[PDB]
């Protein structure tokens, strides 16, 4: 796919300006070469991860540009990995999660090779914490004590000789037959600009999206960024009017999309 | 001593006497306006206003997590609470209510050590008792810790008492530093080269400087008057880097 | 009280007038929708049919000229309904209306529910051809406001 | 389970003394853009 930017410009702002006013109680000079490089690096970031294809099954592209030639676009990260293993839930459960991850691992993975690193947002981590805690609270066979778990430990404080601390968080869940589910947080799920539907428990409803990249070992990368050898990024200045033009071609390839599982909230669908 | 107390009470406890119309209404003895600026404790309450009667730990953690959600790093979420001694007991009981709702877990004495063994002549197995919850660790990196300051429990300036014992200012929680800013957030303002004024107005002899005899007299009376003067202010750059939690019987 | 005030540093000033400091926010913003009209200019109500049924043009009215000549913007459902802007903004007073077609291979149109007032829209990127390309897109900036204190 | 508005982002078209600090201040009552 091919990306292009322009700006009619020197160091000073132009017509697309926006001010930020805070709510408190009693209510420079723009470097234009750092904004055309940052907001064109982000055009390539949005084309790589959040891009969509416009072809038929007849091979025909559907959108034509200013020159009458068709705008050729290729799918991104998040569309190519959403052609297999993708689930849209209305309520999060470990009953849905441990059954989705076991049947894929029983049919594709050896028992030692069953580590599943959930990449999610920050509020997806507190929702996974409360769903393991609800599951652990139904394990009435075992009496959970502070001796092993240490949810209440002893901290050193000036105020008391025996001074305590409190708090914990479930970050891992281990399922039968070797299915281990870990959890780490990517910060880009919590984007207030791109993610605009809100979740009633806090956040932007995209942090509640769970993405298992890297199912298994492949002996090669499954997902990578395509590039042309040499220098495929272009730059031009059109002095009259003084317009800075930038152009860049790029691509993303997912070889096996069946090795990527996604749990998206169903409020982000349709 | 009294001039330094004037300097500390102005810097900490100052209120801006500028009106809503941008005018000053307090006029001095000459007739010009007395212009004052906000203190430490007025500049710091404009953003994270909070008042209460019943302390809730859930509301404290869900107000330190909604401004530090994806803005502060996971290792940058230690929030030290400066408060009084009676704010530490109100914090202790509220964490104690939180860990008594955790009925999934059993808080055994073998790890919390609330009842300890001590040596005594009274018994062969003599026991001790006592504990205090001084820290709560919220999920996703947020840690909350107390720092009891004797500045809060001062019974001279703080006259409104609390019904649960002590002054009401002891029950006030202020998290002055949230994260790292790349610069000092709270500092004290001074003018460069501005030495604080000191002058004497004396007649035939000066008791202050021990001087007998005056070439240039102020008046004919046998006296000496000392005048001291200082221009001073404070600054809080980011008041959203600071959270307050005040008892509402202080009436804002 | 003095032990508390000694933990704060001291910045020295030149004059005794009021002093300022400039506070800033981000440059990346989403813009609400005002209304959406189809190709004949009549507004898309909530109880209406789909709008872009054949990669057909329609209009998106925004309260500010924030979007540019060839960018793909998305609604509240990102990447489900990509909207490629066709041409510059026609300014209906302060409002800016863009002629808009659907981009992501969409052959059934966007629902009428997805084109209502209040839905925020966000810039993704600006795609062009491989052949004989022309200029698209634009760059957005941000401005600081000031706070104040005195002596 | 409720928000409160701490900022509002407005365009400019909908609108020296001493400085305390030289470098600008990013408030925590402002979202910031993510890479």
């Amino acid at each position: 796919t091919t990306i292009r930017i322009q700006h009619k410009v020197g160091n000073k702002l132009n017509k697309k300006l926006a001010m930020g006013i805070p709510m408190v109680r009693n209510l420079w000079m723009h470097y234009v070469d750092w904004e055309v490089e940052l907001q064109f690096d982000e055009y390539k970031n949005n084309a790589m991860a959040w891009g969509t294809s416009n072809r038929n099954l007849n091979g025909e592209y559907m959108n034509f540009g200013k020159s009458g030639n068709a705008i050729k676009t290729g799918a991104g990260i998040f569309e190519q990995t959403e052609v297999a293993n993708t689930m849209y839930y209305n309520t999060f459960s470990l009953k849905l999660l441990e059954d989705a991850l076991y049947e894929l691992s029983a049919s594709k993975l050896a028992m030692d090779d069953r580590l599943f690193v959930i990449k999610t947002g920050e509020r997806g981590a507190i929702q996974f914490h409360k769903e393991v805690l609800k599951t652990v609270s139904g394990w009435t066979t075992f009496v959970l004590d502070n001796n092993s778990t240490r949810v209440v430990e002893k901290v050193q404080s000036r105020l008391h000789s025996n001074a305590l601390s409190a708090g914990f968080q479930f970050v891992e869940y281990k399922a039968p037959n070797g299915v281990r589910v870990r959890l780490d947080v990517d910060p880009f799920y919590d984007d207030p600009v791109r993610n605009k539907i809100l979740h009633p428990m806090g956040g932007v409803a995209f942090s509640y999206r769970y993405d298992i990249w890297y199912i298994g070992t492949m002996d090669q990368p499954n997902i990578f960024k395509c590039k042309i050898k040499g220098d495929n990024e272009y730059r031009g200045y059109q002095w009259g009017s003084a317009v800075i033009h930038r152009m860049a071609t790029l691509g993303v390839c997912v070889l096996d999309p069946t090795r990527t599982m996604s749990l998206i909230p169903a409020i982000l669908q349709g | 001593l009294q001039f330094d107390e004037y300097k500390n009470n102005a810097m900490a406890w100052g209120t801006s006497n500028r009106n809503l119309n941008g005018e000053y209404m307090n006029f001095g003895k000459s007739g010009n306006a007395i212009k004052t600026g906000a203190g430490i404790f007025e500049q710091t309450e404009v953003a994270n206003t909070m008042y209460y009667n019943t302390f809730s730990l859930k509301l404290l953690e869900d107000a330190l997590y909604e401004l530090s959600a994806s803005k502060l790093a996971m290792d940058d979420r230690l929030f030290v609470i400066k408060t009084g001694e009676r704010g530490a007991i109100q914090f202790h009981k509220e964490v104690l209510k939180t860990v008594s709702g955790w009925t999934t877990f059993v808080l055994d004495n073998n790890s919390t050590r609330v009842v300890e063994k001590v040596q005594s002549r009274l018994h062969s197995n003599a026991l001790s008792a006592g504990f205090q919850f001084v820290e709560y660790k919220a999920p996703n990196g947020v840690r909350v810790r107390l720092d009891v300051d004797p500045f809060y429990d001062d019974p001279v300036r703080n006259k409104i008492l609390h019904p649960m014992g002590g002054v009401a200012f002891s029950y006030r929680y202020d998290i002055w530093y949230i994260g790292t800013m790349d610069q000092p957030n709270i500092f004290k303002c001074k003018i460069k080269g501005d030495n604080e004024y000191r002058g004497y107005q004396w007649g035939i002899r000066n008791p202050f400087t021990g001087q007998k005899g005056n070439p240039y007299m102020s008046f004919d009376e046998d006296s000496a008057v000392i005048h001291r003067m200082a221009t001073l202010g404070v600054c809080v750059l980011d008041p959203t880097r600071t959270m307050s939690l005040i008892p509402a019987i202080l009436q804002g | 009280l003095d032990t508390f005030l000694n933990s704060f540093p001291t910045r020295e000033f030149e004059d005794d007038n009021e002093y300022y400091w400039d506070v800033i926010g981000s440059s990346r913003r989403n813009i609400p929708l005002v209304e959406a009209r189809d190709e004949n200019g009549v507004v898309v109500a909530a109880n209406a049919a789909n709008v872009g049924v054949g990669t057909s043009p329609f209009y998106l009215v925004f309260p500010e000229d924030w979007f540019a000549d060839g960018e793909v913007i998305v609604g509240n459902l990102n990447q489900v309904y990509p909207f490629r802007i066709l041409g510059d903004a026609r300014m209906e007073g302060t409002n800016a209306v863009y002629k808009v077609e659907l981009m992501g291979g969409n052959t059934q149109g966007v629902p009428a529910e997805r084109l209502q007032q209040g839905e925020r829209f966000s810039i993704e990127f600006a795609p062009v051809e491989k052949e004989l390309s022309r200029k698209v897109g634009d760059v957005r900036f941000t401005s600081p406001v000031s706070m104040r204190n005195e002596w | 389970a409720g928000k409160l508005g701490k900022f509002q982002m407005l365009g400019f078209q909908h609108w020296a003394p001493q400085k305390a600090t030289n470098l600008m201040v990013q408030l925590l009552a402002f979202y910031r853009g993510k890479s």
């Binding site: 420079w28 470097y31 940052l38 | 803005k71 | - | 470098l23 890479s35």
Partner: peptide, 17 residues
Amino acid sequence: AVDQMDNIDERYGFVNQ
């Protein structure tokens, strides 16, 4: 300079003059 929580800095885009 992007922050550890992926947040970009808006003060790099300015020139003091």
